Amino acid sequence: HHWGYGKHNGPEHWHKDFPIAKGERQSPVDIDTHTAKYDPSLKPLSVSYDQATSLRILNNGHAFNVEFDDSQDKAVLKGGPLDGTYRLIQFHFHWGSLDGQGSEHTVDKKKYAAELHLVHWNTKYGDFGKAVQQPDGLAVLGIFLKVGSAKPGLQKVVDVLDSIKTKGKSADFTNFDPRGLLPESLDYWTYPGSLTTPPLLECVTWIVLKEPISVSSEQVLKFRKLNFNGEGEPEELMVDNWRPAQPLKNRQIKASFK
Ligand SMILES: CC(C)c1cccc(=O)c(O)c1
Numbered sequence: 001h002h003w004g005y006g007k008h009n010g011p012e013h014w015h016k017d018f019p020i021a022k023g024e025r026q027s028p029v030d031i032d033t034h035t036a037k038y039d040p041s042l043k044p045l046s047v048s049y050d051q052a053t054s055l056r057i058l059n060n061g062h063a064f065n066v067e068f069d070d071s072q073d074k075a076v077l078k079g080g081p082l083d084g085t086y087r088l089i090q091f092h093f094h095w096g097s098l099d100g101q102g103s104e105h106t107v108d109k110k111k112y113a114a115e116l117h118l119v120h121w122n123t124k125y126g127d128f129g130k131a132v133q134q135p136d137g138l139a140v141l142g143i144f145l146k147v148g149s150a151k152p153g154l155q156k157v158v159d160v161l162d163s164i165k166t167k168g169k170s171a172d173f174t175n176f177d178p179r180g181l182l183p184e185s186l187d188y189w190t191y192p193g194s195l196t197t198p199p200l201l202e203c204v205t206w207i208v209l210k211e212p213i214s215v216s217s218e219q220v221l222k223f224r225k226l227n228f229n230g231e232g233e234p235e236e237l238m239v240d241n242w243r244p245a246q247p248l249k250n251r252q253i254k255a256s257f258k
């Protein structure tokens with residue numbers, strides 16, 4: 001009876017195994033565009049993905065993760081609110097059963113169909129496992145997905161999903177270029193928060209882009225054909241793998257843009 005996104009093991013239950021669920025810097029949050037503060041001290045984000053090396057795609061039972069070689073500084077995030085260099089380890093999405101929900105962060109209470117998380121860890125901590133123990137360990141770049149025109153740079157991902165339908169399945173996934181998932185603008189909001197799944201550790205500088213990417217209805221429909229279950233177990237569609245907005249508490253969201 002481990003955590004998940006059902007009635008009996010979903011977000012309202014997580015605090016029993018993971019008490020930090022009710023902590024002081026949990027994610028996601030609603031982004032109130034009118035009360036976010038423009039911060040002129042914030043730097044442009046530096047997204048350096050030209051040498052990114054993707055390796056594998058994995059159904060981990062709650063998402064599909066596209067994994068990168070993080071054994072060197074090949075795909076790094078810097079600048080913005082960060083001090084130091086953060087290496088890309090993996091990206092994944094959170095999505096809904098319907099186009100009107102699926103994002104974790106919301107914008108003036110608006111839910112997008114999905115949210116992309118590009119996960120990076122602070123190289124001064126040496127590895128991801130160590131980084132998650134630290135208040136500045138991770139930098140997650142969050143990008144909203146709306147349904148409309150297809151995102152061509154997403155289709156290679158969509159096309160391999162039928163090979164990792166069930167929990168624990170993996171497939172080789174080389175030469176995928178994550179630059180193909182980024183919007184035009186790197187205008188962002190930023191705040192200190194947490195992993196949005198167990199263990200809910202409070203180790204994340206969130207960087208949420210203002211501009212959504214468009215994906216097609218067919219693209220997101222293919223996300224919804226994945227399974228939470230293992231092969232040979234009863235079929236539970238992998239949908240609604242998002243945590244709702246948490247209390248902002250003693251935090252202010254900062255904007256990079258006016
Ligand atoms: C694999 C889990 C712990 C995780 C790690 C890091 C970032 C995320 O956005 C997320 O949803 C989940």
Ligand SMILES: [Zn+2]
Nearest residue numbers: 092094117196
């Ligand atoms: Zn995530």
